[PDB]
């Protein structure tokens, strides 16, 4: 029943996520998680993606409570919006040069792949064949 | 937008099927999963036709289907392995005619994951345990035990997961009364991943691993592990115990090896090849479809060859080792993905393309004209017994269930003259291909009309002992016609009643003498030319005719009723007591009296003074009006029938009053239905009695379970309504119009005209108004290529004798595609044919042939851009095209003049290109997209005049839609990219891009900024561009307005009304044989009521597969403003307590919800 | 974390190779094409091949995804 | 309301039914909420068998009521993750 | 028939939630398309 009020609470959560204190970001991450799990399957993915545009910069936090809230918000956003946008967010950082940044991105991608192992095949990026092995599948190019 | 998508044409392509005693009785039950819905059929083998007993939609993707029976149980429970992680074992209830889930045990996550079990399912042969294994590195087996109430008590499964161990196939072996065991075709993958040189991948081979389920020890251990040289593409189990040895048989390319549990003879029998086959020998023959049939004493197997012929192999076990397997081709059948050999003369083979075949196996399997190859018969390891293609001798085909899967293209239009528009879908694979035109009428599959312009149509049967109407008298004022109920209704004079006078009615009231009410009176007429006629009451003719079993009441003007009772000699005797009603009775009917009474209990006649009088037809209460029914207006008809009995008087206006027909006067209730007078009479429909009121709409008050309800029907325009029964259907509704009779089944008839090759796209010419279809069966030999290969084989085997005669017979008369399959091979070769089918009939009025390596993909027949108004068609064909992997030469676009006003495919010239120009549409010039390069090239007769081409696309453009100054192209990565079609400015700039990656294979623009896409994972996504977007800009995305999953790979979509009138929705045809219309809901309150009903039904009725409806409808991407009509249809099919609970949750009535669903269905 | 979470299909780590991730993606794509009836019908009835022949070709292509490792 | 320790079993679930004590009654076994108890709790193995018959799938008191998953954990279907009985390691 | 203050025989309620006699409801549906209670869109339905 929250879909009438998602657009009302969107700028409040947007102002809360930009706060200096980690408590506001953690509790707003819990807000995004419960709001994403609440009205899943109702077409409110634009405001959820807009909130994810503020949540996903906060993945570099080191405190355990706020990073647990960030992981729960990422799980709720991957349930609600879909694994395609999470794969789009993680594809440019899974092969990051930094060890810690690519480790955190690999943790998020491993959680997304545990949750969405079946649906990630159709949302896999279109990469051509290289010198190591063939990559472009010809079964998807078949038309009947 | 709020779209309530509903599927009209269901997918019928059965991907898998099982059979057994799943019906709980001696009747054989076969359950076939036709996609998202599984249908269980128990057809009669004496009739031979296949009829589906029930069908249930589970809303999921089934990866493995199996059935199993317990120890001594007469019912075979079905264990379904779906995409959800809950394995469901269900028992079919024949009393409810549906499957009830006995148990549902959760195993893992939903979807078709790699480590998720459910890809392979098997059961123990002794009914001890059921094993579910994944595609890789996961397996489990739960022990199934009988409870105290003979219930399937499930158990916790034991873990059988090994690191990097893929499974090809698995089957539970027959261990008898001992501990059960299951064999699997394991393949190691750790050494192939570890070794980078690829030597371990070549060194790897399939191994038969038989693991014994130690039920006493409560553990699972691998008993035997035998490495096999041949890779196992299939696996079957021989019937152990009294039907033969306990072992397995692994099939490969012309090598079937049988091994038992221990030391057995590895009889590597070669496959019996065809006698001088036209197919290439490089393609190996393997048992794709295997069916082991065990008799009371012996057992046998049925296998599918490379040509598709069903071969029967006997089991010469001889109690020691696998010695012989007499592999003889039993019959020639079509291309079947799976075949099942049932008992009692039944053999079902599910065709992957075309009609599945349900044959009657009358013989014992030895009635085959083909040669026999035995496993004990030695050979030189180069050939077997040449099994020539024999006819259907051992098993005769008795049912051909037509299936549209696979589907290629479709187009629906009201070009033909019919009650409904014609949807012509060009589809098929190889030479097994056709264009099926489907049209509806209600179900008017057979059209029968009464002769002339009759006043009434009454069944005057020869006798009451005869079940069929021997003489359906269609009687007019001038003459009459006799038409039998055999779906051959024509004028004849075999009635014998001599109906030259104007007969009001003629019905078989007596045992052999039909009572006919006419201007002469009441005449008892037998089957011969004898009619004893008694006069009507008074000098006026009888207008109202209450007809019953023994007593018939003829009411003339003034309400004077004369009662004709059934005499002991069979004639009709007039009663000595008569009385007049209040006014002149218009029409009448009599209630169905019981067999103990010698007369009618209550015969009701409706006068013109807004009243109906019901009187007892017995001699003790003769001429005494008992029940008075108060009509609202002046009654034009009356009808007394069962549901005790009730009499309804219908008026000339829209008001009919029904009261209780009894010895006392009952309460009269008035109800409304077409500005026509009433002609209500008793009829039978859907197992219920009804009175059909004559109006503009098909209104029939049906009294089902003592509840008279009148609702409109979806028939054609008519002025009267009645019942009908003939050879086509047992009980239907006949809507009688001006010299027409609409038939309502209380479906759409499809006729398939065959084509040359497998179709690719259908194009209708503008000048011709005829479909210039292109058939391109790729990765197969062309007809000229097969003729050249047959000539080369005849030249090679001409030098020998009988080999030259065999080569000439194989070249002249090869294996046909209708019986034994057309022998075709190759990869770059393709059968191409351009055929012109007229709008009147689907026969080919023209034929254009291409090269043997070319496949025609682009089909567009319109006027030429470079030339004038001449309809020059540019058809694109890719030459030497191989699907897997990418290997093509180039695409040639041929321009054709389309002579004889488009009825002749006269090719003018052609022009080649390196890329594939499969997209060619008119754009101000014409937009032709070859590869990633789309050019606005004028349609020249010799060659196109390309002006500007841009190659900024990702991979290609599989489909381009345009409405003016803009072209939206569907790429491999992006679902829709819109480029501003500035043909005057000669500049190509991409106006709009997309962010959601989808391999869109369809296009249907609902608006200028709206683009539809059908992804490769079967997702329908309608995306609109953002408002206030600049046309001369770039780097702008389009938001997805709606996204849904249809459960099948959607092929095409067109934003046009698929029904006459109603709602102009969008119709999408899928590749699995499904067609669905996405009706946009323009009412917010109706959309909210549908959403509340869907939210109630998602919790009240769970799916059979165990997956959620929202999870199944949003598998690829999340759903957005999409409502599925399958749950709305299944809500009306629920139980009455569940419907009452859903109506209480929705704060309405269940009949009101059913009426709202019927209005949503009739909105179209 | 969990041991079975790292041992799950499609899992990885911070030092996961690109060829190993591509091979896992190709194996998951082959398993999804084998599991789905509509995807196998779309990739099978386009060519002139049987359904079980396409399943055997996909089973060979699953091992072929581990064909050239590095 | 959670702790970083106390991994549960990560075992394959069976036919045994979970059981909750009154001190932590009504809580979700995963996310510790109190909203919409939808799916029953399966406790896999010898967590039920033996001396731990009818005990708590949380702290360890004598269980009185059936444990449940909430609807929010079954939105992503975390109930198939395995046995939720706490093993103190 | 609540306007003429007469007797009612075979009572029935129309689509505008007005209960009256069957002959009176038939005459009201034939004479006018809408009900005379509150001008609702009953569409002249003479049903029980
Ligand atoms: Zn507790
Ligand atoms: Zn929870
Ligand atoms: Zn446990």
């Amino acid at each position: 029943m929250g879909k009438d009020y998602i657009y009302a609470v969107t700028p409040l959560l947007e102002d809360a996520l930009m706060d200096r204190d980690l408590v506001h970001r953690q509790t707003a991450s819990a807000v995004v998680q419960h709001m994403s799990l609440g009205v899943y399957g109702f077409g409110c993915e634009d405001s959820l993606n807009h909130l994810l545009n503020y949540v996903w910069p906060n993945v570099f936090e080191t405190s355990p409570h706020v990073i647990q809230a960030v992981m729960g918000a990422l799980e709720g956003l991957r349930v609600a919006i879909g694994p395609c946008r999470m794969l789009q967010y993680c594809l440019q950082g899974l092969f990051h040069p930094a060890r810690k940044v690519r480790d955190v991105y690999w943790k998020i991608y491993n959680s997304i792949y545990i949750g969405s192992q079946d649906a990630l095949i159709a949302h896999y990026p279109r990469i051509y064949n290289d010198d190591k092995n063939t990559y472009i599948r010809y079964e998807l190019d078949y038309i009947l | 937008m709020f779209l309530y998508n509903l599927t009209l044409q269901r997918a019928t392509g059965i991907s898998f099927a099982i059979h057994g005693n799943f019906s709980g009785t001696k009747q054989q039950e076969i359950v076939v999963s036709r996609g998202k819905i599984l249908e269980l059929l128990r057809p009669d083998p004496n009739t031979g036709k296949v009829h589906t007993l029930l069908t249930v939609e589970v809303f999921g993707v089934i990866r493995s289907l199996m059935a199993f029976r317990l120890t001594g149980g007469t019912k075979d429970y079905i264990v379904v392995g779906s995409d959800s992680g809950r394995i469901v074992i269900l028992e079919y209830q024949p009393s409810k005619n549906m499957f009830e889930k006995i148990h549902q045990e959760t195993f893992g996550k939903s979807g078709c994951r790699r480590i998720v079990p459910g890809q392979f399912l098997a059961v123990d042969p002794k009914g001890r345990a059921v094993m579910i294994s994944a595609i890789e590195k996961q397996k489990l087996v739960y022990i199934l035990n009988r409870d105290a109430a003979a219930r399937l008590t499930i158990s916790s499964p034991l873990e059988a997961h090994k690191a990097n161990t893929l499974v090809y196939h698995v089957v539970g072996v027959d261990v008898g009364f001992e501990n059960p065991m299951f064999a699997c075709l394991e393949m190691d993958y750790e050494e192939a991943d570890n070794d980078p040189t690829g030597e371990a991948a070549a060194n790897t081979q399939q191994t038969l691993t038989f693991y014994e389920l130690d039920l006493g020890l409560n553990h699972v251990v691998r008993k035997y592990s035998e490495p096999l040289e041949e890779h196992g593409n299939f696996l079957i189990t021989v019937p152990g115990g009294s039907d033969g040895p306990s072992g397995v048989l692994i099939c490969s390319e012309n090598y079937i090896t049988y091994k038992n549990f221990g030391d057995q003879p590895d009889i590597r029998c070669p496959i019996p090849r065809r006698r001088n086959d036209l197919d290439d020998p490089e393609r190996g023959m393997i048992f794709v479809c295997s069916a082991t049939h065990k008799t009371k004493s012996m057992f046998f197997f049925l296998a599918q060859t490379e040509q598709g012929d069903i071969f029967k192999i006997t089991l010469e076990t001889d109690e020691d080792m696998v010695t012989e397997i007499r592999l003889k081709y039993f019959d020639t059948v079509p291309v079947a993905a799976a075949m099942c050999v049932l008992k009692t003369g039944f053999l079902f083979v599910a065709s992957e393309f075309g009609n599945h075949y349900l044959y009657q196996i009358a013989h014992l399997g030895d009635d085959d004209e083909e040669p026999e190859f035995s496993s004990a018969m030695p050979l030189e390891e180069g050939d077997t017994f040449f099994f020539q293609p024999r006819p259907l001798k051992n098993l005769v085909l008795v049912d051909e269930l037509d299936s549209l899967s696979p589907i290629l293209f479709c187009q629906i239009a009201d070009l033909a003259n019919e009650d409904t528009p014609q949807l012509y879908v060009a589809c098929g694979r190889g030479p097994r291909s056709s264009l099926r035109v489907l049209r509806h009428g209600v179900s008017e599959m057979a059209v029968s009309e009464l002769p002339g312009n009759p006043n009434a149509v009454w069944t005057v049967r020869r006798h009451i002992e005869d079940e069929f109407d021997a003489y359906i008298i269609v009687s007019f004022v001038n003459a009459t016609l006799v038409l039998s109920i055999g779906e051959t209704v024509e004028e004849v004079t075999d009635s014998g009643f001599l109906g030259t006078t104007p007969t009001l009615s003629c019905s078989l009231l007596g045992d052999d003498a039909l009572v006919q009410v006419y201007p002469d009176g009441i005449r008892h007429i037998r089957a011969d030319k004898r009619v004893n006629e008694w006069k009507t009451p008074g000098k006026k003719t009888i207008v109202k005719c209450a007809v019953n079993q023994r007593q018939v009441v003829i009411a003339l003007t003034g309400g004077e009723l004369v009662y004709f009772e059934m005499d002991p000699s069979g004639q009709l005797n007039e009663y000595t007591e008569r009385k007049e009603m209040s006014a002149d009775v218009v029409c009448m009917s009599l209630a169905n009296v019981p067999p103990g009474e010698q007369r009618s209990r209550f015969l009701a006649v409706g006068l013109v003074d807004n009243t109906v009088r019901i009187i007892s037809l017995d001699p003790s209460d003769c001429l005494q009006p008992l029940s008075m029914q108060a009509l609202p207006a002046q009654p034009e008809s009356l009808c007394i029938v069962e549901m005790f009995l009730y009499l309804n008087i219908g008026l000339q206006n829209g008001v009919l009053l029904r009261t209780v027909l009894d010895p006392v006067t009952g309460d009269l209730s008035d109800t409304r239905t077409g500005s026509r007078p009433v002609k209500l009479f008793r009829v039978r429909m859907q197992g219920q009695e009804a009175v059909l009121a004559m109006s503009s709409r098909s209104w029939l008050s049906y009294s089902y379970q003592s509840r008279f309800h009148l609702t409109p029907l979806s028939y054609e325009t008519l002025e009267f309504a009645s019942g009908f029964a003939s050879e086509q259907c047992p009980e239907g509704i006949v809507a009688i119009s001006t010299n027409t009779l609409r038939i309502l089944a209380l479906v759409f008839n499809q006729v398939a005209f065959p084509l040359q090759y497998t179709p690719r796209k259908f194009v209708i010419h503008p000048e011709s108004n005829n479909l210039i279809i292109i058939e391109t069966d790729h990765n197969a030999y062309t007809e000229a290529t097969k003729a050249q290969r047959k000539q080369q084989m005849a030249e090679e085997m001409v030098e020998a004798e009988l080999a030259a005669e065999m080569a000439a017979a194989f070249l002249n008369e090869n294996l046909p595609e209708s019986i034994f399959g057309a022998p075709k091979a190759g990869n770059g070769q393709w059968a191409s044919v351009i055929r012109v089918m007229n709008p009147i009939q689907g026969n080919t009025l023209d034929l254009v042939q291409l090269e043997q390596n070319e496949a025609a993909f682009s089909v567009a027949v319109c006027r030429f851009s470079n030339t004038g108004e001449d309809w020059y068609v540019l058809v694109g064909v890719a030459k030497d095209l191989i699907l897997n992997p990418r290997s093509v030469a180039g695409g040639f676009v041929y321009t054709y003049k389309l002579v004889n006003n488009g009825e002749k495919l006269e090719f003018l010239h052609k022009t080649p290109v390196e890329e594939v120009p499969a997209a060619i549409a008119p754009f101000q010039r014409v937009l032709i997209g070859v590869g990633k390069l789309l050019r606005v090239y004028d349609l020249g007769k010799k060659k196109l005049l390309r002006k500007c081409e841009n190659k900024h696309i990702a991979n290609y453009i599989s489909g381009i839609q345009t409405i003016g100054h803009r072209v939206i192209v569907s790429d491999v990565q992006e679902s829709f990219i819109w480029v501003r079609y500035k043909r005057n400015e000669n500049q190509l700039i991409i106006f709009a891009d997309d962010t959601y990656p989808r391999w869109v294979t369809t296009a249907s623009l609902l608006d200028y900024d709206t683009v539809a896409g059908a992804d490769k994972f079967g997702n329908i996504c309608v995306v609109r561009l953002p408002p206030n977007t600049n046309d001369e800009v770039d780097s702008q995305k389009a938001e997805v307005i709606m996204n849904y999953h249809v459960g099948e790979t959607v092929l095409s979509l067109q934003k046009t009304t698929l029904i006459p009138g109603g709602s102009e929705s969008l119709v999408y045809t899928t590749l699995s044989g499904g067609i669905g219309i996405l009706v946009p809901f323009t009412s917010h309150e109706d959309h909210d009521f549908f959403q509340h009903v869907e939210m109630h039904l998602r919790s009240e009725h769970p799916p059979l597969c165990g997956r959620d409806h929202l999870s199944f409808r949003s598998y690829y991407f999340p759903v957005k403003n999409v409502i599925d009509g399958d749950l709305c249809e299944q809500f009306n099919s629920m139980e009455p307590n569940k419907q009452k609970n859903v109506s209480e949750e929705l704060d309405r009535t269940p009949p009101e919800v059913s009426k709202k669903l019927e209005d949503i269905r009739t909105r179209y | 974390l969990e041991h079975l979470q790292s041992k799950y299909i499609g899992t990885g780590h911070a030092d996961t190779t690109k060829w190993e991730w591509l091979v896992n993606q190709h194996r998951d794509s082959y398993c999804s094409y084998m599991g789905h009836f509509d995807l196998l019908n779309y990739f099978a009835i386009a060519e002139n091949e049987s359904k079980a022949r396409v399943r055997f070709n996909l089973m060979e292509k699953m091992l072929q995804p581990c064909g050239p490792p590095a | 309301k959670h702790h970083p320790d106390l991994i549960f079993c990560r075992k394959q679930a069976g036919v045994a039914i979970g059981r909750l004590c009154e001190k932590c009654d009504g809580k979700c076994v995963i996310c510790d909420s109190y909203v919409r108890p939808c799916t029953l709790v399966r406790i896999c193995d010898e967590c039920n068998y033996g001396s731990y018959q009818g005990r708590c799938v949380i702290c360890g008191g004598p269980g009185v009521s059936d444990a449940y998953y909430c609807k929010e954990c079954t939105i992503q279907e975390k109930d198939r993750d395995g046995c939720p009985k706490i093993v103190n390691l | 028939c609540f306007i003429c203050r007469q007797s009612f025989q075979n009572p029935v309620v129309t689509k505008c939630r007005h209960y009256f006699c069957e002959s009176c409801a038939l005459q009201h549906f034939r004479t006018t398309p809408r009900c005379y209670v509150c001008d609702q869109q009953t569409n002249g339905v003479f049903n029980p």
Side-chain angles (χ1 to χ4, degrees), chain D residues 21 24 56 58-59:
Chain D
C21 78
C24 61
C56 201
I58 321 296
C59 46

Side-chain angles (χ1 to χ4, degrees), chain A residues 40-43 79-85 88 115 119 122, chain B residues 111 759 885 997 1118:
Chain A
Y40 161 69
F42 287 101
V79 164
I81 311 177
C84 182
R85 312 277 187 259
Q88 279 159 348

